Amino acid sequence: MAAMEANIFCTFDHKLSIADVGKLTKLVAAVVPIPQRLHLIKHYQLGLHQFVDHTRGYVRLRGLLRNMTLTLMRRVEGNQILLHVPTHGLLYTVLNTGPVTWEKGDALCVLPPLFHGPLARENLLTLGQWELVLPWIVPMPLALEINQRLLIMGLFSLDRSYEEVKAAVQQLQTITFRDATFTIPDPVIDQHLLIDMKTACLSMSMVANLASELTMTYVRKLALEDSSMLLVKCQELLMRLPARPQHVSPDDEIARLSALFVMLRQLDDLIREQVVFTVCDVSPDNKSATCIFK
Amino acid sequence: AMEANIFCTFDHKLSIADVGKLTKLVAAVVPIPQRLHLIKHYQLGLHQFVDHTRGYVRLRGLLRNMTLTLMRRVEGNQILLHVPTHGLLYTVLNTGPVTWEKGDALCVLPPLFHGPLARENLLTLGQWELVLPWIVPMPLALEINQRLLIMGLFSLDRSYEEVKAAVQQLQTITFRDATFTIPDPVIDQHLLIDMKTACLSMSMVANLASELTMTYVRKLALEDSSMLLVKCQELLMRLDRVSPDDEIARLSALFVMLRQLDDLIREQVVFTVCDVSPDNKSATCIFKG
């Protein structure tokens, strides 16, 4: 059959006014997802309004967004939008969408938009009750702590009262990364979240089993003699309860450390989604950047 | 027909002997903190990051995000540098201590041999000493990471002779026609700060994962739709044969000590050998970033 089209023309069948095309002209060098790739696609599949559910599962939207195909916007004109699907490891300009200040060197993730709906008040091409929902591009630690707080909310959802969850969401929704506050929308239970919790508990059990005595006792061995602020701040979250080690071996413990690194990797992959942009130079008004690795 | 390159200059004077020394490193890797166009010589390599107090782990953490480049040509006017790209092949020197073979996954490492040496005497200006990162095959890099971490873990019990024997076992590393040794990370009977926090985060995530597991699997057991869960809890029950805000803080602590260990538990391949030249000074490898 036909090959992969680098250029994709989109066509708005419905009538656009001049203000909507004027708003769309500001959307150049922006990233949009598509479910399928054709040379001439319709405007319904473009965007993310096709996947806004009544469940509003943020993990569901996240896993759905992970399986879409990312493209860049180009050459906005009358009822036609050029989309460039970008290739691996080449340089591409980009325009930020979410209200996140960007720096250099920090890798970027693609994410579903926080506080999605009319509460964010976005006037993005509203026509035929279809919005143009843009996926946010955030740096590494913002997406990392978003997935971390979602998993912590999931692990705290078990065997707790509903008001305990209501007293937890007021603590966990506030993220103030890079001097800009952000909120977590609708942290609910989901079967995908059950899958993440099951693999998290299995990996935690496995790394608890494969932990040797020296790894288990290094914190006490350092806390008996050394003294620092970080040692104090990490000691208070631990529990209460010169000797020779009973049995050590290099060749056994390097195998233990390799398998333990494997288990920590199988724990790490939950919160680390993917690297999709590596910024070289931002624009000095923080409205655009250049990137590699597409 | 020119190509997109990086024009690096030198503010110190350069001898003809130093130019002839620099032209030995044609296909050499050089990290650069930011890919500008007209850069001085002060940001070639890792001499900006040589520190007395800091250690190997922060060098690896910086080298994870450095912009690696290759040299093209040396002139009395200026120096040419080349940024590589993914999916293209390049010639690259084997400045590392280990010979390569075809198809070996290669990656970039901070130099274990440090300061003044008979091999580190490259392009040494007055306040400047050009240092180059090593290009090592991937399993030797994994072995060096594991052995250096476990040599850092035995820092608090060097008084025992058996621990010194285990350290002397770990400090020697064999490979294919390669019996080089590494320096021990403990100096002045103390550990450097980055390695200390790395192994501290390791011990902390091990302690927290041993702590919080039983309550979580007990909470998960009352919705048992997976038979893996009951053998998961049976493992912990055979191994032995709390405030909610404390629970939240311990979860966030475990995940932040895991996040601070992200660069050590994994690494990416940088090059793989398309083919290797004889005499093994250099090899033609495809870039992979």
Added chain:
Amino acid sequence: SLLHTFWRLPVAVFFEPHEENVLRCPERVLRRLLEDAAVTM
């Protein structure tokens, strides 16, 4: 009377027919069967 099981914690089953079926007759059926064994002697 009661067996000594090697695995301490018990385990659920997907109840495949390709799996061997697991002793699903409850205690009233065993009461009926002990009555049948008593009356057939």
